[PDB]
Amino acid sequence: YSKSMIENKVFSSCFKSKNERVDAYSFACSSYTDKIEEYLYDPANSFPYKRGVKLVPKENSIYVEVGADTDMYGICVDVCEFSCTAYVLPITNNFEGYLVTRNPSIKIGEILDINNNGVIIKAGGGPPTAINIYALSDSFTINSINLIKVAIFGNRGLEKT
């Protein structure tokens, strides 16, 4: 898929709850001194936008591919499809923003984990979580893709259950 996604016959119809857009600005709270890196991504394997990515050093360049929490390099916050370039916030930096999830029913304050597809899921799935992820809001569906506001702050000392 894509982020921008088209001519319309008519325009689409308060200030509240207007941020529920797939192409919304990922950082709920931004900050200067946040490190952002550029990498290449596979244009036919998996679309890394708003997903946890890992570094795959290929024979021609270092790419980023959707990955699990065990081998996560960071979070892909934006993509330039013209150059097929992914922008990554390293895991060493804090993040507070909207990410792609696969569970349409997640409550606030729950512990979360990133799966092999770079997707937010409930931490009770069984895999030992290695990152501190907490749900700051209930998951919402855009009609279909599920998004959720999360706070990610570093790695977890001892893997939980």
């Binding site: 001194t33 804090n94 606030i108 702050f153 570093g154 000392g157």
Partner: protein, 151 residues
């Protein structure tokens, strides 16, 4: 409180330039970089100079309170009483400064963990003590540490 405002009748002699920085009112850190991340958060209680954890629930936005362990989120380095806010350095950012210790047993070269009250106690590891625990007043002990994360 960080700055207990009390009126005095006589000026206090303050001329010596040594042993003048180890005090409860000295906010911030001993060494600070321009590229350090600081976040302002609503707080409950008084988590000043302590490890802070983010507590999430009329529904209100999540706040921060004194704590540690698996729920540790950051360190409170400054506080604003009027706005009821706290400046927090996240756990992903290293910090060097004086923090509240549980007791005087902490010495140099000691690995320290933030307890459930946000105080540093001897042994995941969180900090390495740089100086001995010093009693500012009553049971308040301040120890210089260099926070590096969680093991």
């Amino acid at each position: 409180m960080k700055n207990p405002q009390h009126d005095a009748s006589l000026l206090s002699n303050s001329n010596e330039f040594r042993d003048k920085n180890v005090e409860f009112f000295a906010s911030g850190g001993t060494r600070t970089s321009k590229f350090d991340k600081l976040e302002n958060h609503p707080f409950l209680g008084y988590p000043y100079k302590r490890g802070v954890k983010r507590v999430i629930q009329s529904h209100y936005e999540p706040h921060v309170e004194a704590g540690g362990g698996e729920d540790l989120y950051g360190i409170c380095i400054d506080i604003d009483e009027f706005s009821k806010t706290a400046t927090i350095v996240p756990i992903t950012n290293n910090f060097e400064g004086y923090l509240v210790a549980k007791d005087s047993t902490v010495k140099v070269k000691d690995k320290l963990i933030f307890n459930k009250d946000g105080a540093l106690e001897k042994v995941t590891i969180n900090a390495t003590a740089l100086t001995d625990a010093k009693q500012i007043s009553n049971e308040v002990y301040l120890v210089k540490v260099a926070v590096f994360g969680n093991k």
